[PDB]
Design an enzyme around this catalytic site. Structure first.
Site, mmCIF file in Angstrom:
data_model
loop_
_atom_site.group_PDB
_atom_site.id
_atom_site.type_symbol
_atom_site.label_atom_id
_atom_site.label_comp_id
_atom_site.label_asym_id
_atom_site.label_seq_id
_atom_site.Cartn_x
_atom_site.Cartn_y
_atom_site.Cartn_z
ATOM 1 N N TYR A 127 29.006 43.044 34.837
ATOM 2 C CA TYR A 127 29.520 42.442 33.613
ATOM 3 C C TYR A 127 28.763 42.905 32.373
ATOM 4 O O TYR A 127 28.889 42.284 31.313
ATOM 5 C CB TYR A 127 29.500 40.912 33.719
ATOM 6 C CG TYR A 127 30.253 40.403 34.933
ATOM 7 C CD1 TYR A 127 31.627 40.170 34.883
ATOM 8 C CD2 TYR A 127 29.593 40.186 36.140
ATOM 9 C CE1 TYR A 127 32.321 39.726 36.005
ATOM 10 C CE2 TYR A 127 30.270 39.740 37.258
ATOM 11 C CZ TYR A 127 31.629 39.514 37.189
ATOM 12 O OH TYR A 127 32.283 39.077 38.323
ATOM 13 N N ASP A 177 35.511 37.551 34.374
ATOM 14 C CA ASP A 177 36.061 38.890 34.063
ATOM 15 C C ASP A 177 37.101 38.902 32.938
ATOM 16 O O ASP A 177 38.304 39.030 33.194
ATOM 17 C CB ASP A 177 36.682 39.581 35.299
ATOM 18 C CG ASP A 177 36.819 41.110 35.131
ATOM 19 O OD1 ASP A 177 36.564 41.630 34.021
ATOM 20 O OD2 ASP A 177 37.156 41.805 36.122
HETATM 21 N N1 SMV Z 1 33.134 39.194 29.636
HETATM 22 C C1 SMV Z 1 32.571 38.337 30.517
HETATM 23 S S1 SMV Z 1 33.465 37.628 31.686
HETATM 24 C C2 SMV Z 1 31.150 38.071 30.391
HETATM 25 C C3 SMV Z 1 30.318 38.494 29.381
HETATM 26 C C4 SMV Z 1 28.986 38.040 29.596
HETATM 27 C C5 SMV Z 1 28.881 37.298 30.753
HETATM 28 S S2 SMV Z 1 30.335 37.144 31.569
HETATM 29 MG MG MG Z 2 37.567 43.784 36.709
#
Ligand code: SMV
Ligand code: MG
Ligand code: CL
Ligand code: CL
Ligand code: CL
Ligand code: CL
Ligand code: CL
Ligand code: CL
Length: 346
Positions: free
Chosen positions: A31, A162
């Site tokens: 991530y 995600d």
């Molecule tokens: N974009 C997602 S799901 C995340 C960013 C930092 C931790 S999770």
């Molecule tokens: Mg993915």
């Protein structure tokens, strides 16, 4: 007032973060570049992500804006949410780095998938569908539901992860790989313009695996996986064939010998008959005919958890930016505005 920041060398670079975040320690890169920390204002263990090269291209600048917009919108018990966002910059002119703060995930569903009772399967799939009803109500498609994107704690409570990360590459989808085993066939093979129904196929694949302990469709490549899918659910009839816009794909499908749908009670031996019934309504080849998340919450399998007064929907989500063409510094200024306007949760 602006908080005081301090500097520390982490993950090959200098991290500069507000004093409230203490005891930073690097944590996998799935991530992003992430550290665990203790948040002294809230008492939570948190994940702090420092974005890598956020504004290096138009594609990267728009992706940074998209991730921040999505995380700022998500406010639901079964979906990851944003605890904080910050930059050490004191003006737009010096703005270069973006940091995102979320709750620190411990385990994902892979580790669990432990001896799971049918009551465990009911509660886990109920929570996925509760979060998905909320996500779909904002006209967001997740596209990548799989066990590694489901965080689970000691009390069996679940959150979906995600959002806003880079689209998966052709090579990431090649061969004997879990990143393809949960994908709906119409998006795996580019049959047609897809929609939110792709996510219900993924939930069906996850539920089957919690019931048996085994991957439902562990294909060694795209074609092997399609063969496994069609053996279970049957080859398409003329009605669905019409809807496959790709003449090439439609032509390959018709080269395969026809097969009937299998008896799911003989595939999922000994499972709750209500679980078998729900699987038959999720794993339908024609996406138009799959059960929806809102419909599935009312299915008898979830009778001991369903509460129609506690299954909320989302505020409207304006994604008009997705079809907009802007320069790097225009995406950057839009992102800066969203950083400085953030209001923390109650
Ligand atoms: N974009 C997602 S799901 C995340 C960013 C930092 C931790 S999770
Ligand atoms: Mg993915
Ligand atoms: Cl602080
Ligand atoms: Cl959260
Ligand atoms: Cl900066
Ligand atoms: Cl996975
Ligand atoms: Cl909307
Ligand atoms: Cl909005």
């Amino acid at each position: 007032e602006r908080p005081t920041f301090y500097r520390q060398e982490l993950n090959k670079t200098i991290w500069e973060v507000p004093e409230r975040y203490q005891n930073l320690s690097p944590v996998s890169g799935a991530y992003g570049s992430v550290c665990a920390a203790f948040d002294t204002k809230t008492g939570h263990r948190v994940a702090v992500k420092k974005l890598s090269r956020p504004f290096q291209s138009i594609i990267h600048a728009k992706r940074t804006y998209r991730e921040l917009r999505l995380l700022k919108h998500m406010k639901h018990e079964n979906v990851i949410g944003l605890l904080d966002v910050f930059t050490p910059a004191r003006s737009l002119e010096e703005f270069n780095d973006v940091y995102l703060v979320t709750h620190l995930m411990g385990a994902d569903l892979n580790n669990i998938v432990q001896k799971l009772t049918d009551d465990h399967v009911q509660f886990l799939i109920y929570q996925i569908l509760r979060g998905l009803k909320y996500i779909h109500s904002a006209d967001i498609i997740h596209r990548d539901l799989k066990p590694s994107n489901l965080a689970v704690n000691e009390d069996c409570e679940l959150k979906i992860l995600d959002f806003g990360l880079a689209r998966h590459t052709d090579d990431e989808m090649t061969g004997y790989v879990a990143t393809r085993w949960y994908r709906a066939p119409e998006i795996m093979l580019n049959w047609m313009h897809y929609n939110q129904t792709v996510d219900i196929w993924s939930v069906g694949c996850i539920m089957a695996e919690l019931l048996t302990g085994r991957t439902l469709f562990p294909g060694t490549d795209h074609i092997d996986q399609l063969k496994l899918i069609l053996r279970l659910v049957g080859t398409p009839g003329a009605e669905l064939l019409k809807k496959i816009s790709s003449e090439s794909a439609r032509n390959y499908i018709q080269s395969l010998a026809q097969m009937p749908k299998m008896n799911f009670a003989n595939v999922f031996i000994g499972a709750n008959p209500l679980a078998v019934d729900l699987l038959e309504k999720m794993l339908v080849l024609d996406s138009d005919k799959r059960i929806t998340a809102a419909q599935a919450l009312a299915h008898a399998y979830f009778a001991q958890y369903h509460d129609p007064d506690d299954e909320p929907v989302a505020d409207p989500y304006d994604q008009s930016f997705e079809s907009r063409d802007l320069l790097i510094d225009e995406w950057k200024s839009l992102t800066y505005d969203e950083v400085i306007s953030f209001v923390p949760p109650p």
